Nucleic acid binder design. Sequence first.
RNA 1: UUACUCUCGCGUUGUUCGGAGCGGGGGCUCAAGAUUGAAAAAUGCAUUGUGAGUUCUGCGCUAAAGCAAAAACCUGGGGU
RNA 2: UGCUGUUGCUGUUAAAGGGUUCGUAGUUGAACUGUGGGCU
RNA 3: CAUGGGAUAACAAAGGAGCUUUUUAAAGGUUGGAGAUUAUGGAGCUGUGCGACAAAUGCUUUCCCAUCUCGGUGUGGGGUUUACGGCCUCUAGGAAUGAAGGAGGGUAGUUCGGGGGAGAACGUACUGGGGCGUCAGAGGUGAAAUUCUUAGACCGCACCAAGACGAACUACAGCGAAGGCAUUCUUCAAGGAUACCUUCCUCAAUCAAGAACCAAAGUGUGGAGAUCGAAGAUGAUUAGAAACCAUUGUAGUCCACACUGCAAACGAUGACACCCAUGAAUUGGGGAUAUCUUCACGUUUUCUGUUUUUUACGCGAAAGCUUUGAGGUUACAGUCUCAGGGGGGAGUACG
RNA 4: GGAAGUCGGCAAAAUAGAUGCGUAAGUUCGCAAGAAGCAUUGGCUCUGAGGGCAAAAAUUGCCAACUCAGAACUGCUUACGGCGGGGAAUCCAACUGUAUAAUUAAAACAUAGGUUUGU
RNA 5: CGGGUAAACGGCGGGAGUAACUAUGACUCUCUUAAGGUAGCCAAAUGCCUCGUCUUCCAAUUAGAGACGCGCAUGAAUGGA
Lengths: 93, 88, 143
Amino acid sequence: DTINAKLQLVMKSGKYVLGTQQALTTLRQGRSKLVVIANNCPPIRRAEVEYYCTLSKTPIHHYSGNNLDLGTACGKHFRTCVLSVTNVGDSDI
Amino acid sequence: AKRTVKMGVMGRYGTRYGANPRKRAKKLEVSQHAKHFCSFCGKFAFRRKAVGIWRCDGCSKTVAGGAYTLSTPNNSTVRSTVRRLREL
Amino acid sequence: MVRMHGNGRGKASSALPYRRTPPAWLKIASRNVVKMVCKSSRKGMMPSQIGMELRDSMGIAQVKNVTGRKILRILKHNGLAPEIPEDLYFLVKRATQMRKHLERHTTDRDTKYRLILVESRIHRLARYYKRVKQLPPTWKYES
RNA sequence: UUACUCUCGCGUUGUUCGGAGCGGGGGCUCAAGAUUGAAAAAUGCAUUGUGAGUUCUGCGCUAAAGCAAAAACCUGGGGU
RNA sequence: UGCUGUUGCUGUUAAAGGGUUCGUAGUUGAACUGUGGGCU
RNA sequence: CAUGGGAUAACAAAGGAGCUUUUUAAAGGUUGGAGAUUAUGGAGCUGUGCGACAAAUGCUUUCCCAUCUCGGUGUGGGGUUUACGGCCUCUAGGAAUGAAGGAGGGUAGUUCGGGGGAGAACGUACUGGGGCGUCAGAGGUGAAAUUCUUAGACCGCACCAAGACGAACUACAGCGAAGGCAUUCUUCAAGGAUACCUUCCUCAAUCAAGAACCAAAGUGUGGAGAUCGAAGAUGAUUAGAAACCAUUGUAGUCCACACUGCAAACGAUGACACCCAUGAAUUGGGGAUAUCUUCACGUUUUCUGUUUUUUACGCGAAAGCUUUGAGGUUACAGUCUCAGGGGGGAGUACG
RNA sequence: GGAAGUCGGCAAAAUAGAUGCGUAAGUUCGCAAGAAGCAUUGGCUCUGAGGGCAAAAAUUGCCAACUCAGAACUGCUUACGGCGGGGAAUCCAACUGUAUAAUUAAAACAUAGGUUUGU
RNA sequence: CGGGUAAACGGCGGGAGUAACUAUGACUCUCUUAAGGUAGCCAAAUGCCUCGUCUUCCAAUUAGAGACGCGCAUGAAUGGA
Ligand SMILES: [K+]
Ligand SMILES: [K+]
Ligand SMILES: [K+]
Ligand SMILES: [K+]
Ligand SMILES: [K+]
Ligand SMILES: [Mg+2]
Ligand SMILES: [Mg+2]
Ligand SMILES: [Mg+2]
Ligand SMILES: [Mg+2]
Ligand SMILES: [Mg+2]
Ligand SMILES: [Mg+2]
Ligand SMILES: [Mg+2]
Ligand SMILES: [Mg+2]
Ligand SMILES: [Mg+2]
Ligand SMILES: [Mg+2]
Ligand SMILES: [Mg+2]
Ligand SMILES: [Mg+2]
Ligand SMILES: [Mg+2]
Ligand SMILES: [Mg+2]
Ligand SMILES: [Mg+2]
Ligand SMILES: [Mg+2]
Ligand SMILES: [Mg+2]
Ligand SMILES: [Mg+2]
Ligand SMILES: [Mg+2]
Ligand SMILES: [Mg+2]
Ligand SMILES: [Mg+2]
Ligand SMILES: [Mg+2]
Ligand SMILES: [Mg+2]
Ligand SMILES: [Mg+2]
Ligand SMILES: [Mg+2]
Ligand SMILES: [Mg+2]
Ligand SMILES: [Mg+2]
Ligand SMILES: [Mg+2]
Ligand SMILES: [Mg+2]
Ligand SMILES: [Mg+2]
Ligand SMILES: [Mg+2]
Ligand SMILES: [Mg+2]
Ligand SMILES: [Mg+2]
Ligand SMILES: [Mg+2]
Ligand SMILES: [Mg+2]
Ligand SMILES: [Mg+2]
Ligand SMILES: [Mg+2]
Ligand code: NA
Ligand code: NA
Ligand code: NA
Ligand SMILES: [Zn+2]
């Protein structure tokens, strides 16, 4: 998929952070460029993350797989519910 | 090394109850003690407590379904039918 | 695709010319050609795709005839080669999509047969790349 | 917290745990003990160190079998 | 006695191609670095 | 065992960005012999300068930082050359057989097809059921009889239920490794051919051991049960008839999951590669240049890949085969693999 | 002497702990199995291995509780208690279980499995 | 009165002739039932005759085992092996 191709470019060239707590910290600062959320996310946690993105005007993407798929798509061997990319390098988005 | 050739968990029965009845019960015995995938969260952590009751070690969530497996094949068909009729 | 694993006998392919000299109307210096190759790689293109962009829209028929070196050689000198070879990458990607399809459609026996052929192709290819040291030893393919 | 990068790490005798937050530094709290004293020498009779046993306690909590209830008491949400 | 076949057998119908594929030992495996020259 | 020769080959290594030379000058860090002590120097060690010459890849480089008509030549004509500035950085970085009418991968027509999986619907027919009508037979055969029927059979019209199956179009046509695969729409992952001045660079062919798939019948557990129907029942026929024919009917026939591994599983013809005469066709893709409809179709000529047909050399015991070989073989050698050795006993006995 | 006794090996005799080696037919692959069978064992004097705590620390000191293995010498009158005899076959019931208190414990009953009926 | 039903209760045959030595009948007639006992098993805890007949076990076996079967009166969820 097109989103997976860009994640690989970011994973090798840019800068990112994994996990809900670290992603929220980047949103409190101004470094976040894009936030990706898996479809397997607790409803109350998703609503809180989306509220932060609206306040800071950060684009947000709803991933089509669960936290297992999102972790695999990043080359990791663990599950990730939320991803935040602080630096995008050589990528459109 | 491997401790039995044919009967893994039924070896606790010795030579008693007959080969075919032991064989049929083994398939359901293995299923009811395995760990099933949890759609909530992402872990293989669903364990049966009592007949028809499953609890997730990670989610700490309780689901009702299946005497010896988490989801029966008849349940999968029913979910698709209901979703299709709702979309009409 | 044609002979190994199947009965196909197709012959479709390209035929390189006898005259290996770039035309007069091509006025691009070799240094600039190398720059464009490295730029497209950072954008995320594979060597096969890079050569088609230059062919289609830049008038460069063969990079070797202009710069003296092949595209993958240029990327290796600039530290831009892919982690695993390109053809092995695409075969692994195909097998992953087949397996994901098969975990729902468990009775698609034609697809199961095709999965056996693709994985045999992967193991043959990995063996060659380990012998010429383009892959680490103990590299393994996981289903 | 680039912790799991390409044999990831911590831990039990033992069947396992981590981006839904491991390990390290610094802390808050609970349970069971230890120590200092008052009691207490005014009493009793005429000493402080190790091994073995011992269900209080802790290790949080077979099954088509999944392990009583209520009084009494405690805390909170509102209101005064 | 070329009816044991390396030299040198047979396998459509006389005896005899495995139901079809994958595959490890094994056997087999494309081209290329090379026209010496001058004198009667 | 020694030694001469290097054409054909084998072993090992590598996988191609782990990839200057010379000349001068300066600075430091054998004493008579034997036994001790020390110092001066060679030679090499670094770091300074100096002279001379190379370099298979241009440092009068690159990079961004900025700031502003004549002459020679061939036959009076032809062809050949010729007729914004300045600046500061940075600087192993271009020297590597070629891309097999061998293999792998890419992109495209959002290509081609009864290829595979999933979900919704559609179509008549067989059987059964009631609703509307009618009245004496209907069925079946060579001829009959078992069988149904005034308690209304058969026949007629419109419907309802359930389970199978997709007629005509359907062809020496298509897809699939083989077994196999035909209604429509939505959906998932594949496969082959063609086109290419894309990429890569020997990664290949064929096989004991080992693995996967495999019509029908058969087995196990759940469903389903319209049609047909092994076993069985009842009529006939017959010298007899356990059979062929008629009326029925259990297991089955259909679906899911798990076994079994057999077929005239046949082209009775193992796989890969080369050469090879002629004439009409056919399926899919592409290239070049008069017909119909409003982009598709179709004309003519080439081309790659597929299933075939007719009338050459050659081969064969013959029947026959022939670019799709059973040809190119006593003028006997491209590579690998499976099987046979008079007929029975017998694919039997034992393990 | 060794079942010749007796309806009948009734009763008695016999085996015996622990450790090493070894173990058939059959089989629902779990067993059969302690199958069968062979060997050792005392006392005394020694040697080796198995740890905790402090300061190439791959080093130095201090200390506790037991077990196993090996060797020399020296004995038996085989010597508390406690502790399976084994093998080859036929009939019945699958197995654990229940059951006639006071003459019957079994092949009887129950059982999991299979089938049928009513709703 | 007319249909269905046996994992309902239950049931499941007799006579003679016949093959190149004899013996035995694959074969052929005949009376008969709702159907005439199929696969298996046996002198079995089921066989009167009976201590049946052959083999094995012993010096000697009305006992045991393996075979044979016209089975007084074996036999399929009254479940057979
Ligand atoms: K090539
Ligand atoms: K009718
Ligand atoms: K009527
Ligand atoms: K065409
Ligand atoms: K064509
Ligand atoms: Mg980690
Ligand atoms: Mg000869
Ligand atoms: Mg011969
Ligand atoms: Mg033959
Ligand atoms: Mg064949
Ligand atoms: Mg060669
Ligand atoms: Mg009639
Ligand atoms: Mg049709
Ligand atoms: Mg079938
Ligand atoms: Mg069946
Ligand atoms: Mg069934
Ligand atoms: Mg019928
Ligand atoms: Mg019939
Ligand atoms: Mg008759
Ligand atoms: Mg045929
Ligand atoms: Mg054959
Ligand atoms: Mg086609
Ligand atoms: Mg022809
Ligand atoms: Mg020959
Ligand atoms: Mg004796
Ligand atoms: Mg006597
Ligand atoms: Mg006794
Ligand atoms: Mg044995
Ligand atoms: Mg013993
Ligand atoms: Mg025994
Ligand atoms: Mg009993
Ligand atoms: Mg007991
Ligand atoms: Mg008992
Ligand atoms: Mg009693
Ligand atoms: Mg009983
Ligand atoms: Mg039974
Ligand atoms: Mg009989
Ligand atoms: Mg008898
Ligand atoms: Mg006796
Ligand atoms: Mg007997
Ligand atoms: Mg019966
Ligand atoms: Mg009886
Ligand atoms: Na009808
Ligand atoms: Na039926
Ligand atoms: Na019962
Ligand atoms: Zn969960």
